[PDB]
């Protein structure tokens, strides 16, 4: 079943809770929380990093993600791709171009969520294996 | 300080840095530090960008027949829709030209040999279309002069 | 409290001549013992952030603070499994050893070839070229 107007409203609600100043962006690390903070079906519940890394989420430097990119991606997760989706994109881009008059959030894409995430979780694995080797070496002396 | 863009290089998935030369030719080079590969990426619209070679103050653009060229003036043909493909590479298509029936975009691209392809021949899902920007600085820009 | 014994082992592996103080040289030989290849700058860094006295060397209290910052799990999640799932393209719980090696050498705080070689010998137990990361994370968090 499709998406009610209620759903969009709740989206913009928690969006405000993560974006008080209406910069229309959100930080890389806060994304996961945002995905967790939605009602179904938009909701991507934790753990969700591998799920989030699978959607097209361009980031502008420095590691910020735009609202509309998240809206498109998150609604596409649900629908997903179709002709009705294209029309819905027309509507979303229009409604956004309405409720937002300025050009302050218009900044060019520099990477994608997936790249940053690949770096971060690579690091996580590295530091982990390093602590492991150190532990093994301290244990080595008995 | 009206439009908040960036100054970058654009790395081709085909293995080249995108290069806009003084004679106005566009291709790919393996010269790491060619000064002819820095670009002004300027946000002229919602997820839309203009790509201008710094050393030549030239805009990349695409005409009605799909041929990629350079313009000293800022036409609406100098506007590119940016979007990522498979959350890993950035693609740039024309804002005004498409299949018209199928709606598929005409994209900025390079073949395997680093030469510039016709817009309509570059498919968004082929490596030819794929770029990864490698930025140098953020930068503010004066919103440019629209023409015909 | 009762752990102190291993600490007397631990310092003893860093302190080669047992003078009660760790120098950039001894630190160096140990980091190299792990498979790293630190610069002199990197070592003077590993020292200066945990240096209370500013005497350029590291005694027992400083060795404690440093070994504490090091042994501390920053990603307190044993869900660094998630981190591995990020690189498992098809979600079958196996990553090709080649892929893993490439990723670990070319991303983030990149590993040396020595570290990486060891990690793969430990990770690819049957040597079939595929790596079961679940079991590897278990081995790693056994402590
Ligand atoms: Ca000593
Ligand atoms: Ca000291
Ligand atoms: Ca796999
Ligand atoms: Ca195996």
From Swiss-Prot, chain A:
Effect of substituting residue 95 to G: In EA9; gain of function mutation resulting in increased voltage-gated sodium channel activity; hyperpolarized activation; higher current density
Domain IQ: 118-142
UniProt topological domain (Cytoplasmic) ranges: 1-142
Family (UniProt): Belongs to the sodium channel (TC 1.A.1.10) family. Nav1.2/SCN2A subfamily.
Record remark: domains: The sequence contains 4 internal repeats, each with 5 hydrophobic segments (S1, S2, S3, S5, S6) and one positively charged segment (S4). Segments S4 are probably the voltage-sensors and are characterized by a series of positively charged amino acids at every third position.
Subunit-level organization: Heterooligomer of a large alpha subunit and a smaller beta subunit. Heterooligomer with SCN2B or SCN4B; disulfide-linked. Heterooligomer with SCN1B or SCN3B; non-covalently linked. Interacts with NEDD4L. Interacts with CALM. Interacts with TMEM233. Interacts with the conotoxin GVIIJ. Interacts with the spider beta/delta-theraphotoxin-Pre1a. Interacts with the conotoxin KIIIA. Interacts with the spider protoxin-II.
Name used for this protein in its record: Sodium channel protein type 2 subunit alpha
Organism of this sequence: Homo sapiens
From Swiss-Prot, chain B:
Tissue: Ubiquitously expressed. Predominantly expressed in the nervous system.
GO molecular function, one term: beta-tubulin binding
GO cellular component, one term: intercalated disc
Domain of life where this protein originates: Eukaryota
Residue positions, PTM Phosphoserine: 145
Subunit structure, interactors included: Interacts with SCN8A; regulates SCN8A activity. Interacts with SCN1A; may regulate SCN1A activity. Interacts with SCN5A; the interaction is direct and may regulate SNC5A density at membranes and function. May also interact with SCN2A and SCN11A. Interacts with MAPK8IP2; may regulate the MAPK8IP2 scaffolding activity.
Disease: Developmental and epileptic encephalopathy 90: A form of epileptic encephalopathy, a heterogeneous group of early-onset epilepsies characterized by refractory seizures, neurodevelopmental impairment, and poor prognosis. Development is normal prior to seizure onset, after which cognitive and motor delays become apparent. DEE90 is an X-linked form characterized by onset of refractory seizures in the first days or months of life.
Similarity comment: Belongs to the heparin-binding growth factors family.
Role description: Microtubule-binding protein which directly binds tubulin and is involved in both polymerization and stabilization of microtubules. Through its action on microtubules, may participate in the refinement of axons by negatively regulating axonal and leading processes branching. Plays a crucial role in neuron polarization and migration in the cerebral cortex and the hippocampus. Regulates voltage-gated sodium channel transport and function. May also play a role in MAPK signaling.
Name the UniProt record assigns to this protein: Fibroblast growth factor 13
Organism: Homo sapiens (Human)
Portion of the full sequence shown: 64 to 211 of 245
From Swiss-Prot, chain C:
Residues bearing the modification N6,N6,N6-trimethyllysine: 110
Binding locations of Ca(2+) 4: 124, 126, 128, 130, 135
Positions bound to Ca(2+) 2: 51, 53, 55, 57, 62
Sequence positions that bind Ca(2+) 3: 88, 90, 92, 94, 99
One annotated GO biological process: cellular response to interferon-beta
InterPro entries (UniProt xref): CALM/Myosin/TropC-like (IPR050230), EF-hand-dom_pair (IPR011992), EF_Hand_1_Ca_BS (IPR018247), EF_hand_dom (IPR002048)
Effect ascribed to mutating residue 135 to V: In LQT14; loss-of-function variant causing impaired negative regulation of high voltage-gated calcium channel activity; impaired regulation of cardiac muscle cell action potential; decreased calcium ion binding
Illness association: Ventricular tachycardia, catecholaminergic polymorphic, 4: An arrhythmogenic disorder characterized by stress-induced, bidirectional ventricular tachycardia that may degenerate into cardiac arrest and cause sudden death. Patients present with recurrent syncope, seizures, or sudden death after physical activity or emotional stress. CPVT4 inheritance is autosomal dominant.
Protein name per Swiss-Prot or TrEMBL: Calmodulin-1
């Amino acid at each position: 079943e499709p998406l009610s107007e209620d759903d969009f409203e709740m989206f913009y609600e928690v969006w405000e809770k993560f974006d008080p100043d209406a910069t229309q962006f959100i930080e890389f690390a806060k994304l996961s929380d945002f995905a967790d903070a939605l009602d179904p079906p938009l909701l991507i519940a934790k753990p969700n990093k591998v799920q989030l890394i699978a959607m097209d989420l361009p980031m502008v430097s420095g590691d910020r993600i735009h609202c509309l990119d998240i809206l498109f991606a998150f609604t596409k997760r649900v629908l997903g791709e179709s002709g009705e989706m294209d029309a819905l994109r027309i509507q979303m881009e229009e409604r956004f171009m309405a409720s937002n008059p300025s050009k302050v959030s218009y900044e060019p894409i520099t990477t994608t969520l997936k790249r940053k995430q690949e770096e971060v979780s690579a690091i996580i694995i590295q530091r982990a294996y390093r602590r492991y080797l150190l532990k093994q070496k301290v244990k080595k002396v008995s | 300080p009206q439009l908040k863009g960036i100054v970058t290089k654009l790395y081709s998935r085909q293995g080249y840095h995108l290069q806009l030369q003084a004679d106005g030719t566009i291709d790919g080079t393996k010269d790491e530090d060619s000064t002819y590969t820095l670009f002004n990426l300027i946000p002229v619209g919602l997820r839309v960008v203009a790509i201008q070679g710094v050393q030549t103050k030239l805009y990349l653009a695409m005409n009605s027949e799909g041929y990629l060229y350079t313009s000293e003036l800022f036409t609406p043909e100098c506007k590119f829709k940016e979007s990522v493909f498979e959350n890993y590479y950035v693609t740039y298509s024309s804002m005004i030209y498409r299949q018209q029936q199928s709606g598929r975009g005409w994209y900025l691209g390079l073949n395997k040999e680093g030469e510039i392809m016709k817009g309509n021949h570059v498919k968004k899902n082929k490596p030819a279309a794929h770029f990864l920007p490698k930025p140098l600085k953020v930068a503010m820009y004066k919103e440019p002069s629209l023409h015909d | 409290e009762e752990q102190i014994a291993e600490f007397k082992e631990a310092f003893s592996l860093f302190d080669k001549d047992g003078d009660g103080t760790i120098t950039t040289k001894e630190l160096g030989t140990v980091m190299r013992s792990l498979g790293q290849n630190p610069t002199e700058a990197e070592l003077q860094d590993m020292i200066n952030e945990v240096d209370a006295d500013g005497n350029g060397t590291i005694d027992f209290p400083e060795f404690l603070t440093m070994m504490a910052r090091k042994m501390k799990d920053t990603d307190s999640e044993e869900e660094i499994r998630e981190a591995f799932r990020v690189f498992d393209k098809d979600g079958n719980g196996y990553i090709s050893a080649a892929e893993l090696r490439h990723v670990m050498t070319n991303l983030g705080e990149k590993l040396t070839d020595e570290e990486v070689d060891e990690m793969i010998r430990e990770a690819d137990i049957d040597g079939d070229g595929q790596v079961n990361y679940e079991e590897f994370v278990q081995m790693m968090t056994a402590k």
